[PDB]
Amino acid sequence: PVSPKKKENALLRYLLDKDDT
Amino acid sequence: PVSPKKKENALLRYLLDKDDT
Amino acid sequence: LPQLTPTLVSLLEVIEPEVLYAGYDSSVPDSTWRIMTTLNMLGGRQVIAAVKWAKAIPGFRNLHLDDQMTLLQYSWMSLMAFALGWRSYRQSSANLLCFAPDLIINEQRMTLPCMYDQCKHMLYVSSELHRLQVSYEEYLCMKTLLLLSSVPKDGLKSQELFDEIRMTYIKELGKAIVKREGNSSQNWQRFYQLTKLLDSMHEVVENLLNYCFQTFLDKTMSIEFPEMLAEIITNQIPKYSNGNIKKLLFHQK
Amino acid sequence: ATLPQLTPTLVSLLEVIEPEVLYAGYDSSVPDSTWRIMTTLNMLGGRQVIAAVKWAKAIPGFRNLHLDDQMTLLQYSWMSLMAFALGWRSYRQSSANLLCFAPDLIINEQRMTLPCMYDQCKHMLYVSSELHRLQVSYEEYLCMKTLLLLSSVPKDGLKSQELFDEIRMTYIKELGKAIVKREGNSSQNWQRFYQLTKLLDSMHEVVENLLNYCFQTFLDKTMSIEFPEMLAEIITNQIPKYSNGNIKKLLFHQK
């Protein structure tokens, strides 16, 4: 159903995807 | 002889003589 | 003496992020406002470090990405509060809150206008770690557990794997206990007490969150929060306070 | 009758007169540097020495010695006292892993790797590691530090020598009482007394190194490293005779 305040944790997701070095 | 200490640290001497309050 | 084989707790230790400093200028008078603000800045950097940490935890990355965010969102305060208590207990026997070895809340700062009202709970966890004389390994396992201390009431898209991982670390906590004690009776008592500390963590977090949200939603106070914390806080604010979240516990009240 | 202290103990006195730790008020918001770290530490040293004077005057019998001896003792062991206290806070605050000049100012791995920092800190870490290795108790520590104040006298004694030796022997005994109190097994009471007293003796050797490094820096405007009013006068004071062989270093063991 509804869930206002969407796209609230964009930064966190980014940090969880990358990595390797 | 000679006590050449005359001078060196009148600050400490001062600090060691007065604590009542 | 050559084990040359990593254990689950051995890997949990090498990934433990190193303590970071707040780069606080203490050459000028303190003030509640400035300290809370510097600590918030430090909080963001710690949570960011907590992300790389969580990602290195065996099994965490193989959970749905959404759940990875859920767990970190649902326990960022517990993780930081627990870490803080740990350093305080280690550095000064839980007498001083050691947010970072260079920024410590001494007695003088503790008496500031609003310092104690909020620090008392941080001190609580620090006190408990001292009381129980928690070892490093036990501490490591417990902290991992806090990351898996609560989930949304319904489940995670990978709940199946979640409970499996959580189970593994509960048993990991058991192993730490057995090789620190010496006997066997006080092993289960140990487990009882340690798991009891984790349970109470939920309550300490609740009080810290209330305060965090309060100061976050009142700029007359003027306290600032960095990107990471601001982003997370705004997300949690509503869903949290109500009580639409399931807090996992080892001992039911 | 009722106790603790309705009839105070000598070591109980040392505990209450122990000055509390001071914070350097260092600005860590901007990058560090050998020059800035040291200067901040010197200023801190000035205030710590000032507190040491107030501390010394509260030590029963100390200020009954001629006023000049009071001045001599502090000038002859301000480094030993400060370095010993440093090692103590380092040992207690981080198991002698780091140097805790102040609970808010710690010479971490990053700062330890600076240019001249390790060659200096090296000797300081030694005393901390030693306190950690021997698991020195707070009480034994209080007595030992007091003994450090009375660890070096002139080559002709003091103007109140008779009283001095009496005070020193009084605290040597106090140290022994701390050792006995710390344990129930008297088996190795004398063995521990040997270790602790041996450590005290070694302080002379670490002080010398820290001091040579203190004078060399003081006398080098090129290095631009400030010393507060307090330290400046004491360094310029001792600097001449802390080389020619005017001071007699008291030792518990000769060997």
Ligand SMILES: C[C@@H]1C[C@H]2[C@@H]3CCC4=CC(=O)C=C[C@]4(C)[C@@]3(F)[C@@H](O)C[C@]2(C)[C@@]1(O)C(=O)CO
């Ligand atoms: C009482 C709360 C709880 C606090 C936090 C508790 C956990 C924590 C541990 C740290 O090692 C550094 C910062 C944090 C992450 C924190 F200390 C700061 O952020 C300030 C904080 C939110 C708080 O003081 C405020 O709400 C101030 O706005």
Ligand SMILES: C[C@@H]1C[C@H]2[C@@H]3CCC4=CC(=O)C=C[C@]4(C)[C@@]3(F)[C@@H](O)C[C@]2(C)[C@@]1(O)C(=O)CO
């Ligand atoms: C190596 C020496 C020994 C140092 C001192 C050792 C004892 C000490 C302990 C402290 O808790 C704070 C400052 C002092 C009192 C000190 F750390 C500083 O003054 C700097 C110092 C003199 C020194 O680093 C320098 O001479 C560089 O200027």
